[PDB]
């Protein structure tokens with residue numbers, strides 16, 4: 001394998017962390033390949049669940065707890081902390097909240113969160129590498145509670161970063177928020193990528209094509225599929241009661257990705273940096289409810 005940049009995996013990985021049996025587990029947790037029977041049984045369906053009031057309460061709660069856990073990880077970001085250390089803290093924080101860390105064993109993903117440094121687009125695996133001053137690092141958190149999943153992510157700065165890192169992370173965040181601001185009943189899911197790409201391109205960045213936002217609720221990933229690039233062919237129209245994410249990945253160089261031999265870690269083919277933000281959204285009647293928002297503070301962590 002020819003790496004695309006300076007990052008490398010730092011092995012070995014700690015043995016898989018157990019979740020006490022009193023925490024309720026999603027279907028894939030105990031499947032030997034981490035397959036989710038419930039997801040597979042809707043593979044290739046474009047139909048979108050209309051959530052009940054009970055479903056809504058359940059998504060509100062898990063999304064709020066997920067936000068709490070992200071904030072725990074945010075607190076840990078500093079030069080010399082390993083991503084595995086972050087992940088151990090996340091895993092304990094999930095358990096403290098009586099929730100399962102959704103990533104763990106999802107399709108045999110080995111950790112409880114995803115840590116994506118610099119040229120890693122997404123799905124980086126926490127490992128023994130200490131964070132370096134000048135890195136950007138995204139931490140992606142998903143929790144499972146009472147049958148519902150809640151999913152969010154933010155990109156963080158490790159110490160002082162360069163102006164390109166500032167502009168990339170700020171633009172990405174703005175991309176997400178401009179998309180969110182368009183969400184309301186009657187908007188086609190395919191419109192969001194036009195908005196995102198328009199803002200990225202204006203700032204000289206590209207938009208990753210291989211990974212999309214997604215329906216989420218009883219299923220970790222389900223309909224709708226929400227591309228983040230322009231002129232996509234996404235199926236469906238927003239309706240009050242829909243719950244989904246938006247999670248644009250924006251890059252300094254070109255949009256093309258490839259995957260490491262671990263099967264998960266997605267990197268820019270050119271080795272330039274990428275950044276991402278993610279929220280879980282419920283469509284309302286005004287527009288939308290940002291389930292994974294901060295309730296106590298105005299801005300994402302990288303501004304603060």
Ligand SMILES: CCC[C@H](C)[C@H](N)P(=O)(O)O
Nearest residue numbers: 103106109140142151247
């Ligand atoms: C390994 C599970 C992690 C999943 C794929 C991420 N939370 P996402 O849906 O890419 O935001």
Ligand SMILES: [Co+2]
Nearest residue numbers: 140151152278
């Ligand atoms: Co996520």
Ligand SMILES: [Co+2]
Nearest residue numbers: 151245247278
């Ligand atoms: Co997601």
Ligand SMILES: [K+]
Nearest residue numbers: 116118120274
């Ligand atoms: K990154």
